[PDB]
């Protein structure tokens, strides 16, 4: 199977310096070319520059010219993006693909892709509350509860229920920038009315740039 | 440099139907036409290359044409699963460029929403603020008005919504209202109440509790 | 339409 | 100024689609024609009633 | 690697930028290893940034 993995992508203040990682396998990049390609509110999917391991040439967006540079290490079957003097309008998710692969003329398999943030603003870990199931949240005998991530910078956070073994009627809201420039989110479920109290419910929270992980279990309230 | 201009901006179809989206190129560039699909949560899919071929495992529902500088992708039989952003890009001059993107949407039939609220939480109340959450689950369609009211005034410019891309299996939405007091002011007020407006109710929904009730 | 990093889809 | 152009898409067989032309007024209503002008190659021919000031179409085809 | 007369050049006028911080100093030191047919680019880009925060 063919796989292309970014790593790298963090909070960085404008003027700063980061460094991502592409690490390829089930193909040789020796044999295509490899492609970092940006995509963000502000300029959609937008490419950003290209390498042909082979032998060493490049190519470069006008906008990022100078000050990244795309490189390869095909004994490690990687590639890099040095991303220099940053500034707000290079946040984005950052994808490497290949193009040229097996004959293919366009870029066939994509990364998951690693966002870059560039603020001058600080980490902070979400908190995370209940959104407890109640008679208020109950109706054709099922029940609504949930989690509220809270007050966090910056994204991403990730959301399951009961280690990813609860799945169905899970909504994790999309999240929201608060006016305080932290951002908010809600995760749901939707479970038998009968479940609640004998099933065990537990979101878990992770953001990675805080180092945050949360377990929180939700119950019912006390009376 | 080239660039690519798609249309429409969104397109809104029936399961079955036979959708049609374009792509124009400034300039020429050949056949040297891709077009990706990005689902919600996803990176970028190829499904079609060189203008008209079909990547290897895309479902023949799908197929891509060249005229001049036209393009145009077509789903023959639109699926559930092909609720999602569709996307040209040309690769015949450096830079490559890509299009702005269509997004693709499913109709189906009108659906009302189960409306729920909840509380601050008491571990929230230990700080000083409370959120109150009023949610929408599995209406169709997105439209939808919610308004807060504390002891009955209408609340402005304190709650922010979020919403659902259309769910894999109903391909319903969801939503949630998140209404943001002080915890001084939540402790001051008694009666909460999110008023729900949806063409599928026949008249708003009213979802409320009193602070301090269980 | 806008793309949103939390959906990696667009809003319109 | 940037304005959204609302047009039904109303075909033969009575199926509607709905889509979204957004640029300046010019710009959405060139797209618009231009696309149902595509659709037409298929469908039929097409004719398209301007409502709102021009800025809601419905455009039905013939088959 | 082993660099030319003008990448060692390139090189030197990083190294010497004052109001760089190091952080900045090392990622354009990594950007002409990563590339040498940008040294020139790269040069000016540091020398901009150098500029803007004297
Ligand atoms: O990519 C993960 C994203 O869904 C969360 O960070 C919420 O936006």
């Known amino acids: 199977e063919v796989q292309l993995v970014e790593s790298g992508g963090g909070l960085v203040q404008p003027g700063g310096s980061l460094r991502l990682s592409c690490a390829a396998s089930?193909?040789?990049?020796?044999?295509?070319?490899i492609h970092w390609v940006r995509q963000s509110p502000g300029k959609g999917l937008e490419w950003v520059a290209r390498?042909?391991?082979?032998?060493?040439?490049?190519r470069y967006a006008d906008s990022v010219k100078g000050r990244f540079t795309i490189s390869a290490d095909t004994s490690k079957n990687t590639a890099y993006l040095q991303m220099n003097s940053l500034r707000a309008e290079d946040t984005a998710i950052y994808y490497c693909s290949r193009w040229g692969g097996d004959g293919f003329y366009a870029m066939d398999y994509w990364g998951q892709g690693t966002l870059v943030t560039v603020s001058s603003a600080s980490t902070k870990g979400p908190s995370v509350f209940p959104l407890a199931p109640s008679s208020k949240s109950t109706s054709g005998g099922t029940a609504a509860l949930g989690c509220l991530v809270k007050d966090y910078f910056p994204e991403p956070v990730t959301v399951s229920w009961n280690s990813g073994a609860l799945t169905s009627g899970v909504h994790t809201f999309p999240a929201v920038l608060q006016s305080s420039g932290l951002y908010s989110l809600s995760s749901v479920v939707t479970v038998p009315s009968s479940s609640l109290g004998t099933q065990t419910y537990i979101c878990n929270v992770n953001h990675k740039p805080s180092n945050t992980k949360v377990d929180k279990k939700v119950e019912p309230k006390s009376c | 440099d080239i660039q690519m201009t798609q249309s429409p901006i969104l397109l809104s179809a029936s399961v079955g139907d036979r959708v049609t989206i374009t792509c124009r190129a400034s300039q020429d560039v050949n056949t040297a036409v891709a077009w990706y699909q990005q689902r919600t949560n996803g990176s970028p899919r190829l499904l079609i290359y060189?203008?008209?071929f079909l990547y290897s495992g895309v479902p023949s529902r799908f197929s891509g044409s060249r005229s001049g500088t036209d393009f145009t992708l077509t789903i023959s039989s639109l699926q559930p699963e092909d609720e999602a952003d569709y996307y040209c890009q040309q690769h015949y001059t450096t830079p490559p460029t890509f299009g702005a993107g269509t997004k693709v949407e499913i109709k189906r039939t009108v659906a009302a929403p189960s409306v729920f609220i909840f509380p601050p939480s008491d571990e929230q109340l230990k700080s000083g603020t409370a959120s109150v959450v009023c949610l929408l689950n599995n209406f169709y369609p997105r439209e939808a008005k919610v308004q807060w009211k504390v002891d009955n005034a209408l609340q402005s410019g304190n709650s922010q919504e979020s919403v659902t891309e259309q769910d894999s299996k109903d391909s319903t939405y969801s939503l949630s209202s998140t209404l943001t007091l002080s915890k001084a002011d939540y402790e001051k007020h008694k009666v909460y109440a999110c008023e729900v407006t949806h063409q599928g109710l026949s008249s708003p929904v009213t979802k409320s509790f009193n602070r301090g009730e269980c | 339409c806008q793309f949103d990093f939390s959906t990696x889809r667009l809003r319109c | 100024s940037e304005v959204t152009i609302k047009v039904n898409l109303i075909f033969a067989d009575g199926k509607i689609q709905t889509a979204e032309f957004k640029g300046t007024f010019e710009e959405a209503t060139a797209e618009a024609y231009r696309y149902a002008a595509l659709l037409a190659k298929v469908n039929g021919e097409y004719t398209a009633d301007l409502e709102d000031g021009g800025n809601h179409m419905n455009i039905k085809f013939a088959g | 690697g082993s660099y030319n007369k003008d990448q060692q050049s390139a090189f030197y006028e990083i190294l010497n930028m004052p109001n760089l911080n190091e952080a900045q100093r090392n990622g354009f030191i990594q950007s002409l290893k990563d590339d040498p047919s940008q040294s020139t680019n790269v040069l000016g880009e540091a020398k901009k940034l150098n500029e803007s925060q004297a």
């Open positions: 089930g193909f040789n990049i020796k044999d295509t070319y």
């Open positions: 390498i042909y391991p082979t032998n060493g040439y490049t």
């Open positions: 060189s203008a008209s």
